[PDB]
C-alpha cells in the first residue's frame, strides 16, 4: 500500500551510462524499471497522469526514470506533455479560425523533465503518436483508440511546434511597397528556390505603384484585405461556373471598393479607347455580354490572376495593429480583437485559413507580445496551431544583419506538417541585444548567447550607409539623378548592386529600368520657418534646438528662455524656437531639430520625416534625411524605386520590413522549402556565401 519499486535493479553500469547526472540535482542509489503505486504497476515508457499543486490540472508525462534517491526516497522522472493551454498559447485555446478548434485531446511532447515522489502518479493514459502525413482513415482509427494523441512536439525556445530550378508562388498581404516580399524572394533565390511574389494586397495606391514598378509581373491589388478575401470567395464560384459605347474587353475584377457597395465589378476597356478610359461596371450591369465575362474568367483562371486554395505556397504579411502602445497601451485589453483595429490580425489568419499555404510568414511590432499580456501574439500562434500548422516565433533585430539601426520586430513562421519548418538566421553583425524580450516570450530572441562568441561583422554606422551620396537641398524635385561618384564603403558597394547581382529576377533576363541611377534622393521640403530653423542648427555632433538663440539650460537640465534675450522671431514673425520643443519630455529632450552624426545610428527609421521631435537632420547639409537615405538605412537596394508624394514615399520606407532581415528569412525559407534543412535547432547560421561577397 506504500509505493515500492519492482523487479530487479537496472544493472549498475547500465544505469550509470543511461543517467550519468544521477551518479558521481537529485542523486540515485540505484534505478529500477518499474514501480507499484496504489495497486497498479507502472513501467519505464508508460504514459501517466501526475498530481500537481492544489486545484491545478494534472500533469501529463512519459516516465523516463525510476530511482531510489540518496535520501532513500522513491522518485520517478517524467518527460512532460503539454496541453495547448500549457504552451505559450495559454488562454487562447478558446479561439477558432474558420471552424478550426484545438482538440482537447491533442497534446505536444516536450523535452521538459521533472522528478517526483512515486505517490504523485495518478493513473496510466493511452497516448499515441499519429504521423501527420499518414493516410486520413488510419489516422482517425488511431485517434479513435486513444485517450490522448500527439502529432508534434513543443519546445519553449522560440515557441516551437514541430513535427516528430524550382518555383514557388508567394502572396503578400498588407504588402506596402514590398520590403518583406522583395527580401524574401531575394534570400530564396540564394537558397536555390525561385520564389516570386504573384499577388500583393495593399490599400495605399502609392505603395502599390512602387511594388508594381519594381515587380511588373506581380498582380498588385489596390484594395482592402477583407475585400480581397471576399473577392477570392466569389472568384471560386466564378471559376466553378466559368461565368456606340462598346465593350471590347474585360480587363479587371474587384469586390466592393471605396464608393461601391459589395459584390463583383469588372473593369472594362471599350472599343477605340486608350487605357485610362477603362472603368468599373457592376456584375449585373453586364448581364448583356455574358460571353466577355467568360473570356475573362477562363483567361484569368489560366494565368492565375487570383489564387484559389492550393495555388499559394507562401503567405507573408504585416497586418497593422495599432492602439497597442503609447496612449493606447492601456486601452481595450479584454477583447482586443473586437476592439479598435487589431482586426487585421483576424483577417490575416482568415486568408491563411482560406488559402492553406505551405508556409506562413507573419511580421509585426514587438508590442503584440507585450500588450494585453501578449494576447495578439498568442492569438496569431494559436490560430496557426489550431489550423494544424507547425509554427515558431522569434524576435529579430535589424541592425544584426547589416543596418545602421536597431529595429526589433516579431516574425512568426508557419509550415504545413508536410513541410519542413524554417529556422531563424543568426545575427551577422556584432550589434548586441539587450533585455528587450517580453518575459511572456523570454525565449524567442534570436541572438547568439554570450556563451558563444563568434566573429561577426563590425556594426554599421550612419556614414557607412550614406557617405557616398551627392549633396542636395531642402527642395529637390528630381526623383532621378546621378550619383556624385563611386560608392565608398562595403555597405555602399552592396546597396548599389544591380538587380542581377542581387539575384533579383523581377525583370527576368536582362537588366531592368534605372540602372546605375540615384532614385528618390529627396528630403521632405520643410516650410520656410522650419527650413530657417535647421539652417540655424550648428553642424556638429549632438547639435539640436537647444543650440538655437535665446534658450538655455536651467537647474536639472530643464530648458529655459534666456532672460537676457527676448524671443527671437523669423522673417515670418513666428518664433525661432517653437513652444512644443520647450515642453517636449518635460523640457529635458535633446531631440527637437536634432542633427545626426556619421558616428551614430538611427534606432528606428520611422514614417514621418519632420525635424520637430526627432534627430533627423543630415550631419552636414541644411536639410532632413532624404527618402533614399532612409531607404538605405532600411536596407533597400538602390534600384528599388518609390512613387507618390514625398510624404507617402517616407511612409513606404518607414513601414517596410528591413530588406536584409527579409532576405535572411528568405534564405531559411528556401532551405526548409527545398528540404535542404538540417535537424531541429531553432537557429541557423547563414553561410559565408550569404552575408557579403
Amino acid at each position: 500500500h506504500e509505493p515500492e519499486f519492482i523487479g530487479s535493479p537496472v544493472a549498475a553500469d547500465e544505469a550509470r551510462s543511461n543517467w550519468p547526472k544521477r551518479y558521481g540535482e537529485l542523486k540515485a542509489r540505484c534505478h529500477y524499471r518499474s514501480a507499484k503505486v496504489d495497486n497498479v504497476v507502472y513501467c519505464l515508457g508508460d504514459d501517466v497522469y501526475v498530481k500537481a499543486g492544489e486545484n491545478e490540472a494534472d500533469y501529463i508525462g512519459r516516465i523516463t526514470e525510476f530511482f531510489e534517491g540518496t535520501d532513500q526516497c522513491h522518485y520517478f522522472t517524467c518527460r512532460w506533455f503539454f496541453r495547448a493551454e500549457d504552451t505559450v498559447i495559454n488562454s487562447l485555446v478558446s479561439i477558432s479560425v474558420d471552424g478550426h478548434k484545438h482538440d482537447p485531446r491533442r497534446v505536444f511532447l516536450s523535452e521538459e523533465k521533472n522528478d517526483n515522489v512515486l505517490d504523485c502518479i495518478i493513473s496510466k493514459v493511452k497516448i499515441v503518436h499519429v504521423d501527420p502525413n499518414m493516410d486520413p482513415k488510419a489516422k482517425a482509427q488511431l485517434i479513435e483508440s486513444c485517450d490522448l494523441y500527439y502529432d508534434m512536439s513543443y519546445s519553449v525556445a522560440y515557441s516551437t511546434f514541430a513535427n516528430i530550378t524550382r518555383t514557388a508562388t508567394l502572396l503578400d498581404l498588407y504588402s506596402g511597397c514590398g520590403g518583406m516580399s522583395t527580401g524574401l524572394c531575394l534570400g530564396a533565390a540564394l537558397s536555390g528556390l525561385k520564389l516570386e511574389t504573384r499577388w500583393a494586397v495593399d490599400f495605399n495606391s502609392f505603395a502599390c505603384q512602387s511594388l508594381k514598378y519594381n515587380h511588373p509581373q506581380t498582380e498588385v491589388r489596390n484594395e482592402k484585405a477583407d475585400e480581397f478575401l471576399a473577392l477570392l470567395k466569389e472568384w471560386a464560384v466564378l471559376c466553378k461556373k466559368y461565368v456606340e459605347f462598346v465593350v471590347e474587353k474585360l480587363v479587371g475584377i474587384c469586390y466592393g471598393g471605396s464608393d461601391r457597395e459589395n459584390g463583383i465589378y469588372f473593369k472594362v476597356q471599350w472599343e477605340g479607347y486608350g487605357p485610362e478610359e477603362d472603368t468599373w461596371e457592376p456584375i449585373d450591369n453586364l448581364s448583356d455580354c455574358p460571353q466577355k465575362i467568360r473570356e475573362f474568367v477562363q483567361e484569368g483562371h489560366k494565368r492565375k490572376i487570383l489564387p484559389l486554395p492550393g495555388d499559394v505556397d507562401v503567405i507573408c504579411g504585416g497586418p497593422p495593429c495599432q492602439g497597442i502602445s503609447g496612449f493606447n497601451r492601456y486601452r481595450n485589453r479584454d477583447e482586443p480583437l473586437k476592439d479598435e483595429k487589431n482586426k487585421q490580425m483576424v483577417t490575416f489568419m482568415d486568408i491563411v485559413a482560406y488559402l492553406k499555404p505551405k508556409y506562413v510568414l507573419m511580421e509585426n511590432v514587438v508590442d503584440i507580445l507585450k500588450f494585453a499580456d501578449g494576447y495578439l501574439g498568442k492569438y496569431a500562434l494559436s490560430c496557426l496551431v489550431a489550423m494544424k500548422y507547425q509554427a515558431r516565433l522569434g524576435m529579430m533585430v535589424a541592425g544584426c544583419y547589416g543596418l545602421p539601426q536597431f529595429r526589433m520586430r516579431v516574425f512568426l513562421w508557419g509550415a504545413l506538417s508536410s513541410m519542413v519548418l524554417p529556422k531563424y538566421p543568426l545575427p551577422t553583425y556584432d550589434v548586441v541585444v539587450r533585455g528587450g524580450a517580453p518575459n511572456a516570450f523570454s525565449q524567442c530572441m534570436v541572438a547568439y548567447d554570450e556563451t558563444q562568441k563568434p566573429s561577426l561583422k563590425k556594426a554599421l554606422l550612419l556614414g557607412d550607409a550614406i557617405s557616398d551620396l551627392p549633396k542636395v537641398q531642402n527642395h529637390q524635385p528630381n526623383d532621378v539623378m546621378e550619383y556624385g561618384g563611386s560608392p565608398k564603403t562595403e555597405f555602399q558597394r552592396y546597396i548599389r548592386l544591380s538587380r542581377k547581382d542581387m539575384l533579383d529576377w523581377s525583370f527576368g533576363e536582362g537588366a531592368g529600368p534605372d540602372e546605375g541611377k540615384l532614385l528618390d534622393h529627396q528630403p521632405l521640403r520643410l516650410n520656410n520657418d522650419d527650413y530657417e530653423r535647421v539652417q540655424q542648427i550648428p553642424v556638429k555632433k549632438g547639435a539640436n534646438f537647444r543650440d538655437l538663440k535665446g534658450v538655455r539650460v536651467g537647474a536639472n537640465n530643464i530648458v529655459e528662455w534666456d532672460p537676457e534675450i527676448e524671443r527671437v522671431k523669423l522673417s515670418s514673425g513666428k518664433p525661432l524656437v517653437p513652444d512644443y520643443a520647450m515642453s517636449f519630455i518635460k523640457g529635458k529632450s535633446l531631440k527637437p531639430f536634432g542633427r545626426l552624426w556619421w558616428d551614430e545610428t538611427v534606432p528606428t527609421v520611422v514614417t514621418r520625416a519632420e525635424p520637430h521631435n526627432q534627430v533627423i537632420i543630415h550631419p552636414t547639409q541644411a536639410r532632413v534625411l532624404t527618402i533614399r537615405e532612409n531607404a538605405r538605412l532600411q536596407g533597400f537596394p538602390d534600384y528599388y524605386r518609390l512613387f507618390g508624394p514625398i510624404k507617402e514615399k517616407y511612409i513606404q520606407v518607414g513601414n517596410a520590413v528591413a530588406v536584409p532581415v527579409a532576405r535572411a528569412l528568405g534564405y531559411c525559407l528556401g532551405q526548409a522549402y527545398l528540404g535542404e534543412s538540417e535537424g531541429s535547432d531553432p537557429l541557423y547560421q547563414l553561410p559565408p556565401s550569404f552575408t557579403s561577397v
Partner: peptide, 5 residues
C-alpha cells in the same frame, strides 16, 4: 505536488 519548472 510534482513541481513543473
Amino acid at each position: 505536488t510534482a513541481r513543473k519548472s
